[PDB]
Design a protein around this nucleic acid. Sequence first.
RNA 1: UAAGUGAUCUAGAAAG
RNA 2: CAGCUUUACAGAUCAAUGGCGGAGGGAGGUCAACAUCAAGAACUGUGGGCGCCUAUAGAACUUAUAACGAACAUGGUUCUUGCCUUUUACCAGAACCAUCCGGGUGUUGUCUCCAUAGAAACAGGUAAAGCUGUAUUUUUU
Lengths: 54, 82, 268, 97
Amino acid sequence: TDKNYYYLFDKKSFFNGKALNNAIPGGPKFEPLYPREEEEDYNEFNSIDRVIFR
Amino acid sequence: NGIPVKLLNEAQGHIVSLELTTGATYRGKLVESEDSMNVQLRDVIATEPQGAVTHMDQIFVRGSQIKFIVVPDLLKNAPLFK
Amino acid sequence: FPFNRTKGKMVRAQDVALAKKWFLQHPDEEYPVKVKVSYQKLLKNYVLNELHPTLPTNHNKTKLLKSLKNTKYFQQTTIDWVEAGLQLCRQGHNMLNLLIHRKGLTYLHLDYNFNLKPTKTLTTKERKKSRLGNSFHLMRELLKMMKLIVDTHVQFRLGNVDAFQLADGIHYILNHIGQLTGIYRYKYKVMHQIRACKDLKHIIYYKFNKNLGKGPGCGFWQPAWRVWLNFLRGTIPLLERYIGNLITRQFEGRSNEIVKTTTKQRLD
Amino acid sequence: SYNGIGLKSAKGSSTSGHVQRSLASNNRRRPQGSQQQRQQRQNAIKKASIETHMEKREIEVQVSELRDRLEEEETLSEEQIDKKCEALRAKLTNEWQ
RNA sequence: UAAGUGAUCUAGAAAG
RNA sequence: CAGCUUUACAGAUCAAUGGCGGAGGGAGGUCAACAUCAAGAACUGUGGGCGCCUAUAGAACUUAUAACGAACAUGGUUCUUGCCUUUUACCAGAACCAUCCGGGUGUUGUCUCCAUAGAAACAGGUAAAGCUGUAUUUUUU
Ligand SMILES: [Mg+2]
């Protein structure tokens, strides 16, 4: 009866997961929408030199 | 409750006209009213039965001595009636 | 939703989903891996359906039955469902024999269970003549399935088998379509349906045998049944193109077909 | 894929695509408490290793105080307060060499 | 003083 | 216990004006035919002002974690994948598309089951239902 129970088990959430090729571990998984074009090329953005991991 | 009173209250803000039992007409911005027609006005003229006008700032008027109150035609349109 | 209200439009028994809710929920903990997998599969099935909305016909009021009714050749009765099933089995059987005989192959004999197989060992010419394809076989499979459910109900009606037993039998049929009779052989997207059924069984059985132990006798055939019905929907169209086409051919068999070079073969 | 780590897709793979998180991972994470020893050792190895302004500040404070006093008690004219303040400053200077 | 929770693809029939 | 509006009532003169008026069914069918249900949050006309404003109005249905389905199949086409190496039959994603199993709403038409009156208000009563009421400075003592 609690609607808030379905947090990250919404249809919307599922769709998002599918899009992002990201399994909510309980929920389903699919072929990714987009092929993971791993072509970052060691840029100055999103580097492990730059970001923090708290 | 009195519907004319209600109307008067609604007219609050507007440039109302106001004659007394004495016959001295006023015309100006309505400030406040009560159950008994205890009117107040602002920036108000005052003409006697003779016709000589006299300007004045803040006037209060008692409903007993008031004869009738002219409201603008806008309040005919809406909305306290139905 | 279901009970919140106290007035509603009626949905078809098909259009109710009693399994759905469980699989939508987060799974109950301390379940086996297989059950979890099944749940996941179910979710995936649901999600895909949700995602791609197949919005229906604006135009078509004229359903198949209505058209038939509009003729003089059909008339209508009220019949016991078992009787109807029996009729279907018989009629269906007749159809498959009749068609087969027309085709000329009289040596492929139909069981009354719809398992077709050959009388002699066929010479090669005969074999060539008498290879039925993906339409006819599919139809046969469908008929077999019908017989199986109808057969179980017949049995129940007769003193042969209890109500509970009948229910269980039905459930078994619906889950075991895959093993019970080859549809999947001929059309291997029935595989999806089979998988779904399996998943349902896994879910349903785990729900149903919680405090109670492992064994046969779980009824609750509904979701499986629903799944099969929905599968059949898809087939209706495909079969109507396929089977219908075949019958047309049998009556009036093609003049001048055009091959197509978009094929890998023959292109060069 | 879960936390950027699962195998992208179950197909192709030719495998379950199941993902046990390792218990070597934990070990790898942890030895800054338990590597830690090495660090400690290193630490051990390298373990052993104005007045005028103040005066000025004080003077300033004194001046401020004087000004305040003047403001409080009979010093609407500037010359008086300024004079007194100047005197105070001079005194301060004398005091500090 | 704090380890050890969960992610589990598949899945057959014809003809050649 | 007063007042006005409506039914149930006699016998009226019956003008006056209203309102119920070319005054005549209802309940329903696993019954039809048609219309119409994905669009600028989106409806339809009507005149007037001159393809667009301003008043009229009407409006049944479906929609905000967006849809006719608290429901879910299958095709076809390309592209990418996967098992694979021939194809069908398939894997799973995408984009367009279709088919299907269904759903309403409205209007008719039918089918079935129950039924049958062509005229009543005014002067006000009798009875019952809807709302209002309970002289000493601003309303009428
Ligand atoms: Mg060859």
